[PDB]
């Protein structure tokens, strides 16, 4: 959810 790492709603949650 914020291009990050761990996936997320988006790709990949900031944190």
């Known amino acids: 959810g914020g ?3 761990v ?3 988006f790709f ?3 944190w």
């Open 3 to 5: 291009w990050g790492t």
């Open 7 to 9: 996936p997320d709603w």
């Open 12 to 14: 990949n949650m900031n």
